[PDB]
């Protein structure tokens, strides 16, 4: 009846401009049990001088909208119609639940009948500083049937 477990993907450090960049940095969340909360942290423009000045988030309306595969296209889709009963609070620690505040959170429901995979991107690869390029952070959420 209550959630006591959370998976956290936190890119706070991994997307900084690097000489090897841009690189893909991946965080996979595989869920196969009910009522798991998922929290994704991505750095904000201006959180450090330079370093994130051109960061972007995909989908811009995460977590309500996610990237997911439909045929041979990655499409932006409403999460609440991909997975019925998911809980998304409008705010997270009194701020908008949106990557413009640095954090998104949602809680998966008691039952999922079909394997469902979706993605979020925190993309720093347009930020350039001193010959270095930021990285592209990708979160893959892989929900297996449960309940």
């Amino acid at each position: 009846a209550s959630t006591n477990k959370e998976y956290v993907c936190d890119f706070t450090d991994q997307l900084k401009p690097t000489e090897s960049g841009p690189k893909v940095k991946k965080c996979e969340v595989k869920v196969n049990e009910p009522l798991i909360k998922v929290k994704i942290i991505c750095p904000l423009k201006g959180s450090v001088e330079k370093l994130y000045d051109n960061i972007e988030y995909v989908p811009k309306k995460s977590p309500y909208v996610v990237l997911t595969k439909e045929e041979t296209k990655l499409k932006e889709k409403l999460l609440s119609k991909l997975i019925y009963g998911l809980l998304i609070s409008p705010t997270v620690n009194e701020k908008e639940n949106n990557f413009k505040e640095g954090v998104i959170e949602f809680t998966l429901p008691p039952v999922v009948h079909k394997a469902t995979v979706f993605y979020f991107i925190c993309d720093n690869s347009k930020t350039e500083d001193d010959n270095k390029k930021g990285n592209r952070g990708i979160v893959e959420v892989y929900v297996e049937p449960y309940g």
Partner: nanobody, 125 residues
């Protein structure tokens, strides 16, 4: 004044060849990944190939298409051999600040910018 210009389209018979050109104007494209996409009329655009600053090939063109980059010519090429009628479509090129990114065997295109106007490819007997 940044620009990407596709050319090389044409009309051939099955088994023929074309070479598509993606020419950069106003930046050097070897700091960017370059992706080739195609859209048959009425259908969804699909990834064909990508070269980063490895390489991506859609399963359907493996062994027939080759992507390459000429740093001096500020151009990325797509050599298309053994063309089939299924390859008919408008072909587009675009640039990505990030690496060629593939998720679930799909070329990720949300980072793609400065899409060229496109070049027509027709394979018919």
């Amino acid at each position: 004044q940044v620009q990407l210009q596709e050319s090389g389209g044409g009309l051939v018979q099955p088994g023929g060849s074309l070479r598509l050109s993606c020419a950069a104007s106003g930046f050097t494209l070897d700091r960017y990944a370059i992706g080739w996409f195609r859209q048959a009329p009425g259908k969804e655009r699909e990834g064909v190939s990508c070269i980063s600053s490895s390489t991506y090939y859609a399963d359907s063109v493996k062994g027939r298409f080759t992507i390459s980059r000429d740093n001096a010519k500020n151009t990325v090429y797509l050599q298309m051999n053994s063309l089939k009628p299924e390859d008919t479509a408008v072909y587009y090129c675009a640039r990505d600040h990030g690496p060629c990114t593939v998720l679930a065997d799909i070329l990720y295109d949300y980072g793609m910018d400065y899409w060229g106007k496109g070049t027509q490819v027709t394979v018919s007997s």
